[PDB]
Amino acid sequence: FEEPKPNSELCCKPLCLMLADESDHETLTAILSPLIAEREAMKSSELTLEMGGIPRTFKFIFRGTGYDEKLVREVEGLEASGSVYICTLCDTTRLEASQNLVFHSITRSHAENLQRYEVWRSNPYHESVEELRDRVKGVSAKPFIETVPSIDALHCDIGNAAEFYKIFQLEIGEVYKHPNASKEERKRWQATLDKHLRKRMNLKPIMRMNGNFARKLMTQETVDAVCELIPSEERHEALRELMDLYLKMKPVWRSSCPAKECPESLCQYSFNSQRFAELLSTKFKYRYEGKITNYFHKTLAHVPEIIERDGSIGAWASEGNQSGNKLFRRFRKMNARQSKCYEMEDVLKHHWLYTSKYLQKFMNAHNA
Amino acid sequence: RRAQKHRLRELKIQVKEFADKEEGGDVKAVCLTLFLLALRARNEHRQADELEAIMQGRGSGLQPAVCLAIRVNTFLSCSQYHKMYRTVKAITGRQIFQPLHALRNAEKVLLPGYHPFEWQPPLKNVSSRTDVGIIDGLSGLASSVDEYPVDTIAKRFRYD
Amino acid sequence: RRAQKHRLRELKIQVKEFADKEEGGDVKAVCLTLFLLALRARNEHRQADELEAIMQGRGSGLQPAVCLAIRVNTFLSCSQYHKMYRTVKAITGRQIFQPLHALRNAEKVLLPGYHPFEWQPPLKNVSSRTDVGIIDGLSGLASSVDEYPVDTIAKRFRYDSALVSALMDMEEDILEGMRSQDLDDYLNGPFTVVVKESCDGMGDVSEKHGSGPAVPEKAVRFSFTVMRITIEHGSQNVKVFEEPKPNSELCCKPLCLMLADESDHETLTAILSPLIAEREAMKSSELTLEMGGIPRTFKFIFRGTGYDEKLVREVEGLEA
Amino acid sequence: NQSGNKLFRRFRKMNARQSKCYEMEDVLKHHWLYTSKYLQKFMNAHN
DNA sequence: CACAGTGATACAGCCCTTAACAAAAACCCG
DNA sequence: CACAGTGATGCAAATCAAGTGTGAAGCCAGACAAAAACC
């Protein structure tokens, strides 16, 4: 068995529904700890189950990948999002990721974070605060959910698209020649870019970046519409080359099986990653000196390793859970009792039944 | 029923003698298939298949499983399904769909806590009881005023 | 089928040569009737009842206005109805629901622009075309670069056409209402309708991507209901139809949908002035409409009660 | 008309085309259909 | 390379009629 | 005094399996015989 639509709204099955803050830690652990107990129990057993007159035995492998970056930082015991310690796979600082930018290796795991929290709590070498935080590499809490280090694909799309949006807004103002600017000059650059994007690419402007905006934005037509507003031409060829590199490197971490359908784009990832990084460090040093986004570090440093280990990225993305969130509001308004003591049960039952595949072979039985 | 005899008394006998000397004696069959041919040259295949439905076994009545699959896959509510079923049954006579409680009693095959199973090492700190479905997600948190205050609502399956 | 031609390719000639002589040549129903009487001689009386129920469209089949009411009244979109119909026809073999091209063809009977109607006197500044449906609510507002920038989308019904459609679908209710008040059915007295009008804008309707003008993210709907219908019998006035649940969502009939702001006055007046012109014309005439075999005569009274205090102060010209 | 606004918010995203051009006519046609007494009396088949 | 719609439109495919030839199986008996 | 849902629950009402042996009714037969809506 191999699931055809791994990011569908029809294959994600709901398991636990609660009404609590994502960032409130205590009630979150209070609800989720029985689930972790059952998972670490059944990670070492053999389920015997009768399947059409014969008993058969199943073993299990759980892969936690449908988590956004903020929740991995929260429940894996790592620091917050804006720290010096960026990547949830490797041990590197933010200034080091802007000096090397390609060559890393995956080092963080779950047992390592557990032992590092033990090191932080015991303080077994008697160091100061800052030397201890250097020793434990930013772990300051107890990790209570085992996960696989990977990259969420959907939020990588949205983060890289917003970063390119800021690059476009910073190139029409020539900030490499006006390194100081007011508030209102930047506001006017944003308004000019919004008007020209609506005039050219038929895009209405939004303050929260979506995924459809991210797919419609990362084209060459948008860099032509933006290059219409730059006075120079060296900035034209730089934006042209950079968007070409990003489109050469996008469909490796977005395809469901990059080893088969786009193999030559998969193979050229390290070469194109070094080209993207040297272009960022040369022709865009007014934006990437002393800093980088952590999604650029993930996208440029760790994608071939995740591809080699787990076979695919984007099959394991959080797209299916977000489409489940689309279903959840519909099921809460349309298919539930309107009482606070009954709504979670009815919604959980309906969202279970909707994803049930026995009720889905019926609706395409006309294709027999 | 009566007063159409003086107009069809003539045609019936050349139906009778032809079907006797040609087919073997059937009359209902040979006026059945002639009306099939008349409907299909008429190009009214829907009434032809409904006559086939009256001849062979009726397709009245769906299974409760397929009405469940329909009601949950087209985002129908239970009240909308109820008045659709009520109108269809009160207009067309026969009961094409199924009532709500049949869908209820046939949805329990698909919710968890219906099938038997076991784990060959029995799992630590969870019961081997096999009929638990929608359980409370708090897992019996201390909801007294003398404790850390809780204010959330949580419902969950068992993971196994 | 080809061999059922090959075996009956003489009796087929017999039945087509008797069809032209006995009744005139009606090839379907004579063999249908022989099949009914053959079930009588074979003694099945329930089966022939199922046969005539099928050939009147009753025992299954579901005549497509009923399927339209089912697709509409249970909030079923056309794609979901297509899924349901397709898998029901795939399972049962029968065709219980109608395909949605039949729904579309049975839909146009109730949309505006179907019936004949005659105003008496003719309406000023109103054409007498009787086939006008969904029209652009701009009414030809000039969208050139030289003059005032309009940025709204609107669609509307012509007012008299919509009043004709809304009077024609509740024909049966008017007939039953005059029946229950000991009146006739051939009566064509001058009906006095009363029509309650209401307009209110909305907020946070999101603008879409794509080609079109710079539309604001607000919508304004203009709608009406039909509260009472009163006919004059004898000396005094009797009522025929009454809206039983007047604040329903089933009786606020839509008339114009624009993507404007009710704060804005220019685009609001520009979109909304054709409907006020039509209403002002219709306040002083008579409508003749054929209602169940008889031409009958209507005249209207429009009441604008359904406006909030802000819109009344902003439209009637008072201070804020 | 406020309940009609609820119906409009439903009909904009359930049973109308997603385009800036021809979505207002779809919503207006469907909300015309929904308020027809001739179709509502078919859902009252018990007299 | 997210994916299952949302509705109208367009077109294609399959199925009747005419009437005469055709590929082909099912028994008969020289 | 807004009004049409939102689904589970539970009580009442409707249907039905079954015996076997009855009644009620439709209808076959061809032919003989009055109502009635047009010239």
Ligand SMILES: [Ca+2]
């Ligand atoms: Ca309002």
Ligand SMILES: [Zn+2]
């Ligand atoms: Zn890293």
